[PDB]
Amino acid sequence: FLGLTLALSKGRILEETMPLLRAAGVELLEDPEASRKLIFPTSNPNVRVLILRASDVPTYVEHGAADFGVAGKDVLLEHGANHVYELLDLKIAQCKLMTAGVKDAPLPNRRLRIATKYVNVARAYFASQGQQVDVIKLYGSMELAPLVGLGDLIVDVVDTGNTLRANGLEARDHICDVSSRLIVNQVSYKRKFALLEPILDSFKNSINS
Amino acid sequence: FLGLTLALSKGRILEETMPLLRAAGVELLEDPEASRKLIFPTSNPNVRVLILRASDVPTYVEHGAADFGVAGKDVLLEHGANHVYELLDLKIAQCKLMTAGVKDAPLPNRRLRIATKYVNVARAYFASQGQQVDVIKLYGSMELAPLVGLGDLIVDVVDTGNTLRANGLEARDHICDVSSRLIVNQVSYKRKFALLEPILDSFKNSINS
């Protein structure tokens, strides 16, 4: 396959990327959410799509298994973005990285334990607050952890805050805003620029409105 | 909450644990697969259930946020089981850890790159084969990696082999058999033994047939 391979993930990222792809002459030929297929063709024979877990998008792009991708800033910060280029803030799937805990619960007088998927982000953020913290690495359902005493706080992505509120948690601190970003493999950017450039230009034009 | 907190995960583990719980006088009052609730009551007021991602079950049990749990051997090997007790092989959700790659594809003459969620298991298994390997940490859909050149092999859990076969992959090596195990927090085992013992005994009796 001599074309470009685009790494996306399911849900909001796929949903909100598709219009940008449509304006650039790229359309999926079926709903990937309903398929066992791993690699998907498009209306453009020079572009194919991978549907990955959000956390794996930087990995595939870094290694060149995908030439470019759409990854949330949260994933990029946690994974590390030193071995891809971030070309565009696409302003999609916007949310916040935040700390949260049980509503009105006092912080303990000791090293805090932070339950999170975002272990690197958590250590860095708390370091900026003057705190060395213990981190408990979790893979999902962060909202449960404070309820059963696993960790004093969580770090997670928050959009509406409804999950938090439904579970008797409240956001404590805003860490940073998060949006999905167009990343490119550093070799693909050089070797396949003629294929990338018009797509990149279309995306840039689309995001300007 | 003074009772026991049991950590389970969705799908086959939940499905196949429920009969064992039923024989021990513990029944869920609704289908957790259909609910936003995080902690679930049971027919026994001394037992509640957490529905976690499989990878997080050892974590919750180790820290004492759950007193006991059902975790796959694959997760235990990868996480490390030094800070829980493994009491029972429940013989449920049986499968194999295996290596796999593209059907009939020759191995490269260099350090192999292993794409997997099971980074620790992969390094240990290949070390037993006389090989130092590079590992690429992935979070899902392992079957894709060899198709797009990410890694030379994968390590994954295989049951039927259908996913592998559907994607033009074949299992290369059998690493070990995997089944779900009853694990207990090391303090809970001492402090709450009177609550645990009859449940543990029931499970043992059930698995004997």
Question: What does this molecule look like?
Answer:
The first copy, chain A, has a 9-stranded mixed sheet with strand order 2-3-1-4-9-5-8-6-7. Chain A is α/β, with parallel strands linked by helices and 209 residues long. Chain A folds into 2 domains: 127 residues, D-Maltodextrin-Binding Protein, domain 2; 82 residues, D-Maltodextrin-Binding Protein, domain 2, CATH 3.40.190.10. Chain A is elongated, with a radius of gyration of 19 Å. The relative contact order of chain A is 0.20. Chain A is 29% helix and 33% strand. At the A-B interface, helix 2 of A face helix 2 of B. Chains A, B: One of its GO terms (cellular component) is cytoplasm. Chains A, B: It is found in: Cytoplasm.
